[PDB]
Amino acid sequence: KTVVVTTILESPYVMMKKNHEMLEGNERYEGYCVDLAAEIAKHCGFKYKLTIVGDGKYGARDADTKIWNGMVGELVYGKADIAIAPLTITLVREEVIDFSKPFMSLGISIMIKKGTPIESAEDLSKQTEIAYGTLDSGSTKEFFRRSKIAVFDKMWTYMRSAEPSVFVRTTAEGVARVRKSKGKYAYLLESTMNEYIEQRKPCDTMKVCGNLDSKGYGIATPKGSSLGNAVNLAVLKLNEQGLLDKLKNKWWYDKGECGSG
Amino acid sequence: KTVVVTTILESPYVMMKKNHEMLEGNERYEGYCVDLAAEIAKHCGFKYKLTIVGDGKYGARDADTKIWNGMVGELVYGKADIAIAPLTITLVREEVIDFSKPFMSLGISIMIKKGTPIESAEDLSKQTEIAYGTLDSGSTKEFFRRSKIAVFDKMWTYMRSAEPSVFVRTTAEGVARVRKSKGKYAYLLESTMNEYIEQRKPCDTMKVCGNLDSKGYGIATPKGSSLGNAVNLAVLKLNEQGLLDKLKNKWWYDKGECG
Ligand SMILES: N[C@@H](CCC(=O)O)C(=O)O
Ligand SMILES: N[C@@H](CCC(=O)O)C(=O)O
């Protein structure tokens, strides 16, 4: 029985090679999560097929219908057997899916144009001439909606109120918004992606110092999945061997295009 | 009549214009604290004269001799009526002079050459092949001297004992030492100046994220000065009016060469 792996196009976790138009199957994709998916399949011993999430979203729950979208949705409604993507382990998501122990750490961070007069999240709260927003349906927006910190709650109010909408449908759109906005838009995105983009051309982006919290990515499986335990202890057997850190160094910093390292 | 303002050459707070040799008086100087001095004098309503501290130091107290040097020294001994400079508000200085409320926040930070394998102050404490030092007579040196945190005390011991001299007499000397040291010297300086240098050519210096503490700059006046209240309410009306942030952005980022 073939295993259907649900994932999302997100640099550097899953990208499509240049020759991806003359290729088929799993040989079209490249990144941290494709290799991680391969090695996970080797340790567990199942053949798998890479699928991109249909709606292109990570996973949020409608307040009124209590329905789920994105990869979490595709797991709850039996559209995929396992999710191998930068999917943050959150309390709400744990209600409907199972998470392995974190295979990578991260935290919400700010991304600005190099040379911009911003130095903190509280600075963002005070000012108004620079806009800032969040991904459309991800751990970040959920964090700001349910946050009780005064600064974070204020930022949330501004974002929900500020129009022309400050939110974005894909992180790429956010980074592009920052780069084109001539330092008038700052993007709130997870630290890993911020660092990655920071170390790649045109080298005009900067990560502000300070993570707003500390979470991690986990391997998600449907509640009651026969594959849950195997992958859950598998990622630990890969952490002991240190291959996860070798992958991080492989895709983030071993080939940094900007300045120095 | 005229009030003598004591200050210090420290970019971008007080600098000398590109010409300045074709100018005289207060029109030779430029920076954050020159403008702040202008607005303070406007709100209070006094004509002032800008003077650079004679010994070129901020302010420390000899343990045995007591006595003060730098701008604080010039304030205690009636050599100047007010000090408008990046002068950190500390308890010891507050014992002998008066400080307005902070017009700018800051914290001790590390400055490295871009491409250096350092990520924290504790990393510096553990290793020994990379040197690190501080300004000679400022809030930073006193911070490391009177710190009881294990790492900070260890760094202090290293700096004071191991000396191919690691200290510097002016911030410029520190930044130059970092740039020339090929990533083998890291400079411990307040975060604000580190950010400024980070935003100026040749764009080869970097500020580590971890700040070692959190303090602020205040306008200093001698104990019992008639100008204390006036300047305090001036800086409060300028923080309320928001001009301080416009000045920070003006001198740090409005003319950033590294981006
Ligand atoms: N990895 C996050 C994406 C949200 C973000 O980048 O802020 C998630 O699982 O939803
Ligand atoms: N500005 C500091 C000195 C600079 C430093 O120690 O980094 C003071 O008021 O003493």
Residues B210 and B179 in one domain: yes
Are A231 and A125 within 8 A, CB to CB?
no
> What residue ranges line ligand 1, CB within 6 angstroms?
A 58, 86-88, 135, 138-140, 171, 189-190
A1 located within any domain: yes
Distance between CA atoms of residues B56 and B12, nearest Å: 16
Report the 10 Å Cβ neighbour count for A149: 14
Residues 6+ apart with CB under 8 A from A102: A89, A215, A216, A217, A218
Residues 6+ apart with CB under 8 A from A67: A61, A73
Distance between CA atoms of residues A50 and B169, nearest Å: 61
φ, ψ for residue B180, nearest 5 deg: -80, -25
Residues B22 and B85 in one domain: yes
B97-99 sheet: strands from edge to edge: B48-52, B3-7, B82-83, B220-222, B97-99
Would you state the structure tokens that stand for residue B64, as one six-digit string?
Answer: 């045995």
Q: Supply the angle between the helices B139-146 and B150-161 in degrees, to the nearest 10.
A: 110
Report the 10 Å Cβ neighbour count for B5: 24
Whats the size of chain B, residue-wise? 259
Residues A53 and A115 in one domain: no
Question: From the CA atom positions of chain A, what is the Rg in Å?
Answer: 18
Report the 10 Å Cβ neighbour count for B213: 16
Please state, in angstroms and as integers, the Cα–Cα distance from residue B51 to each residue in B25, B43, B48, B116, B232, following that order: 9, 20, 10, 39, 21
Q: Supply the angle between the helices A32-44 and A228-240 in degrees, to the nearest 10.
A: 110
Would you state the structure tokens that stand for residue B172, as one six-digit string?
Answer: 């410029």
CA proximity to B138, closest of B118, B108, B177, B97: B108
The one-letter amino acid code at B153 reads D
Question: What are A35's strand-pairing partners?
Answer: none
Largest CA distance in chain B: 56
Residues A92 and A5 in one domain: yes
Which string of DSSP letters, residue by residue, matches B146-193?
H--SHHHHHHHHHHHHS-S---BSSHHHHHHHHHHTTTSEEEEEEHHH
Residues B174 and B156 in one domain: yes
Residues A1 and A126 in one domain: no
A47 located within any domain: yes
Residue position matching structure tokens 């976790």: A13
Residues 6+ apart with CB under 8 A from B104: B86, B192, B216, B217, B244, B248
CA of A261 from ligand 1 middle (Å) equals: 26
Are A261 and A200 within 8 A, CB to CB?
no
Q: Is cis: bond before B222, omega within 30 of 0? A: no
DSSP E strand stretches across chain A? 3-7, 15-16, 29-30, 48-52, 82-83, 97-99, 104-106, 108-113, 131-134, 185-190, 205-207, 215-217, 220-222
Please state, in angstroms and as integers, the Cα–Cα distance from residue A182 to each residue in A5, A34, A187, following that order: 39, 34, 13
Q: Which method, experimentally, gave rise to this model?
A: X-ray
The whole-angstrom distance between A107's CA and the closest CA on chain B is 15
Residues A60 and A30 in one domain: yes
Measured in whole angstroms, the distance separating CA A110 from the mean position of its chain's CA atoms is 14
What CATH number is attached to the domain comprising B234?
3.40.190.10
Residue position matching structure tokens 């404490």: B125
Distance between CA atoms of residues B256 and B158, nearest Å: 35
Residues B41 and B111 in one domain: no
- Interface probe for A, chosen from B106, B192, B199 (most Cβ of A below 10 Å), is B199
Residues B45 and B166 in one domain: no
Residues 6+ apart with CB under 8 A from B199: A115, B252, B253, B256, B257, B258, B259
CA of B96 from ligand 1 middle (Å) equals: 53
Burial A175-197 (b: 16+ CB within 10 A, else e): bebbbebebebbbbbbbbbbbbb
Report the 10 Å Cβ neighbour count for A223: 12
Domain range enclosing B162? 107-215
Residues 6+ apart with CB under 8 A from A28: A16, A17, A20, A50
Whats the size of chain A, residue-wise? 261
Distance between CA atoms of residues A53 and A80, nearest Å: 9
Distance between CA atoms of residues B106 and B126, nearest Å: 25
Half-sphere CA count of B11, side-chain side, radius 13 A: 16
End-to-end Cα separation, chain B, in angstroms: 46
Please state, in angstroms and as integers, the Cα–Cα distance from residue B115 to each residue in A87, A230, A245, A256, following that order: 31, 41, 20, 11
Residues A239 and A183 in one domain: no
Q: Is B182 on the interface with A (CB under 8 A)?
A: no
Q: Is the dihedral of CA B177, B180, B185, B188 positive or negative?
A: positive
Residues B182 and B232 in one domain: no
Distance between CA atoms of residues B56 and B71, nearest Å: 8
Q: Name which residue sits closest to atom 4 of ligand 2, judged by CA.
A: B138
Report the 10 Å Cβ neighbour count for B152: 20
Q: Residue B205 is inside which H or E element, if any?
A: strand B205-207
CA of A68 from ligand 1 middle (Å) equals: 15
Q: What is the resolution of this structure in A?
A: 2.9
Which string of DSSP letters, residue by residue, matches B86-131?
S-B--HHHHHHEEEPSPSEEE-EEEEEETT-S--SHHHHHH--SSE
The tally of domains found in chain B comes to 2
Question: What are A189's strand-pairing partners?
Answer: A109
Q: For a pocket test of ligand 2, which of B13, B33, B61, B135 has the largest count of ligand atoms closer than 8 A to its C-beta?
A: B135
Distance between CA atoms of residues A216 and A236, nearest Å: 14
CA proximity to A84, closest of A169, A16, A10: A10
Distance between CA atoms of residues B239 and B231, nearest Å: 12
User: Annotated binding site for L-glutamate: which residue ranges of B?
Assistant: 86, 88, 93, 139-140, 190
Q: Is A114 on the interface with B (CB under 8 A)?
A: yes
A63 located within any domain: yes
The answer to whether the CB of B75 is under 6 A from ligand 2 is: no
Chain B segment 229-258 residues within 8 A of A by beta carbon are: 245, 248-249, 252-254, 256, 258
Distance between CA atoms of residues B189 and B59, nearest Å: 15
CA proximity to B6, closest of B50, B48, B44: B50
Please state, in angstroms and as integers, the Cα–Cα distance from residue A52 to each residue in A18, A82, A132, A137, following that order: 17, 12, 28, 16
A261 located within any domain: no
Half-sphere CA count of B14, side-chain side, radius 13 A: 25
Distance between CA atoms of residues B198 and B190, nearest Å: 12
3-state secondary structure of A231: helix
A172 located within any domain: yes
The one-letter amino acid code at A106 reads L
Distance between CA atoms of residues B91 and A241, nearest Å: 52
Task: Tally helices (H) and strands (E) across chain B.
Answer: 10, 15
3-state secondary structure of A178: helix
Region of residue A45 (phi > 0: left; psi between -120 and 50: alpha; otherwise: beta): left
Distance between CA atoms of residues B186 and B205, nearest Å: 10
Residues B83 and B119 in one domain: no
